[PDB]
């Protein structure tokens, strides 16, 4: 069955001979499983999808069920048009029926195929749900101890469930999410790094939404386990755990407090210095949403020693991370007490804040100018606007603020004329 032409495949599949059909279907599976440019479109154009779908129902011939499930999985793994071809052939209910197969390799292949279909987007995700995929998928995981399942099998099930949680506009149906969540909570406590990664991905999808969606997850009590995973040595686990945590702190002050209460801030010295740029960026974004909170939450950032780390990232990091750090500072100075703001200055925030005013990015300039105005307002309550002015002049900051008067964007030049006119 190695390297058949599509023509030969079609000839075998159209024979009236189940064993010839099986050999031809296996040949198609092998063509479709090759590394360079599997001929998906040629297979579709040859009209083979409906035949493959009909073979999924051949309970009397489990091998042709497996070969066809694998072939269709690989077509469904392609472009949206290729996945559509599979759905249009009636594959969804046929795959759901195979979830009950007594052959674990066939059940697993149906799980995989449904994952690709759901992974296409919200419409197919929702269509898979409407055809009734969730109940039988979850039934495969209803065992006293997940460790008794084959590892590859459990990984595929977790990945497919994660795709049922994925995508927005719209988000998945609330009742589907409520149905899946208890199983996800259990997977988040499993000891396999790929299951943990995909479970965290699932949770990151579910929390990427308005406070009602975040609340559904938070009330299941998973925040402490997410915080534990945030400290994993495996980057593929840290990345989604951090995205999930970052999503949660975009919600209410009370939701944000659960993240703090669970000990998340103790991990941030490491995250804010992580050698992976994207982790530092996401960690700083998360910090910016925490400093946007209440004064008692800003105080926790202070107590955990995180202000020096924010000064660090502002001083030296990838520019996108520096931009998140600027936001973290503007939010802090906007919501913080006078004493908290004084502390920020004492940690050395001014010089690196001023250095960033050379940035070729009008948004970060607006943000920094806002922060400076906030700091001056605190300085006023203390009658110390003069010490701050000298600090800004000393590190070359005044040179930068005056230049910004000649800035194209209207918001920059106004904000900075104000600073010059009032404090310099």
């Amino acid at each position: 069955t190695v390297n058949w032409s599509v023509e030969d495949i079609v000839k075998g599949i159209n024979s009236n001979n189940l064993e010839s059909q099986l050999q031809a279907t296996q040949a198609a599976r092998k063509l479709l499983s090759r590394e360079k440019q599997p001929p998906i479109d040629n297979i579709i154009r040859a009209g083979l999808i409906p035949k493959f779908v009909s073979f999924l129902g051949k309970t009397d011939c489990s091998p042709i069920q497996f070969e066809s499930a694998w072939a269709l999985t690989n077509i469904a793994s392609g472009t949206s048009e290729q996945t559509k071809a599979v759905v249009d052939g009636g594959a969804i209910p046929a795959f759901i029926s195979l979830l009950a197969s007594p052959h674990a390799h066939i059940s697993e292949q149906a799980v995989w195929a449904l994952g690709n279909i759901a992974g296409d987007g919200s419409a197919f995700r929702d269509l898979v749900i409407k055809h009734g995929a969730i109940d039988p998928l979850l039934a495969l995981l209803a065992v006293p101890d997940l460790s008794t399942l084959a590892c590859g099998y459990l990984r595929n099930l977790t990945w497919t469930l994660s795709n049922l949680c994925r995508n927005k506009n719209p988000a998945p149906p609330l009742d589907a999410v409520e149905q899946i969540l208890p199983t996800l909570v259990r997977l988040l406590h499993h000891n396999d790094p790929e299951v943990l990664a995909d479970s965290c991905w699932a949770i990151s999808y579910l929390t990427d939404g308005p406070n009602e969606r975040i609340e559904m997850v938070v009330k299941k009590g998973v925040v402490p386990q997410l915080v534990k995973l945030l400290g994993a040595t495996e980057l593929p686990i840290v990345t989604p755990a951090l995205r999930a945590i970052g999503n949660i702190v975009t919600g209410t002050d009370e939701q944000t407090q659960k993240v703090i209460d669970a000990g998340a801030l103790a991990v941030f010295p490491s995250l804010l210095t992580n050698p992976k740029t994207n982790i530092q960026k996401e960690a700083t974004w998360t910090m910016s949403n925490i400093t946007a909170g209440r004064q008692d939450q800003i105080q926790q950032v202070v107590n955990h020693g995180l202000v020096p780390f924010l000064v660090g990232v502002l001083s030296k990091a990838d520019f996108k991370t520096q931009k998140e750090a600027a936001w973290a500072i503007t939010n802090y100075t906007s919501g913080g007490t006078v004493e908290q703001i004084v502390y920020l200055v004492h940690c050395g925030i001014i010089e690196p804040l001023m250095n960033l005013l050379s940035a070729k990015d009008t948004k970060i300039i607006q943000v920094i100018l806002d922060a400076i105005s906030n700091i001056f307002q605190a300085a006023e309550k203390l009658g110390e606007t003069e010490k701050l002015s000298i600090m800004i002049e000393e590190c070359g900051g005044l040179d930068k603020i005056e230049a910004l008067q000649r800035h194209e964007n209207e918001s920059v030049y106004k904000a900075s004329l104000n600073l010059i006119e009032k404090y310099f």
Binding site: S33, R34, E35, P38, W70, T73, N74, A76, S77, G78, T83, Q109, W112, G115, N116, G119, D120, W159, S162, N163, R166, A197, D198, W201, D208, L235, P236, T239, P240, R243, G246, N247, V249, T250, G251, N278, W285, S288, N289, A292, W327, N331, S334, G335
Partner: peptide, 16 residues
């Protein structure tokens, strides 16, 4: 109010 919303898991996988 001052909150700002926002290496991936693949959406589709081919069995090789």
């Amino acid at each position: 109010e001052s909150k700002r919303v926002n290496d991936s898991s693949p959406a589709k996988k081919t069995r090789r």
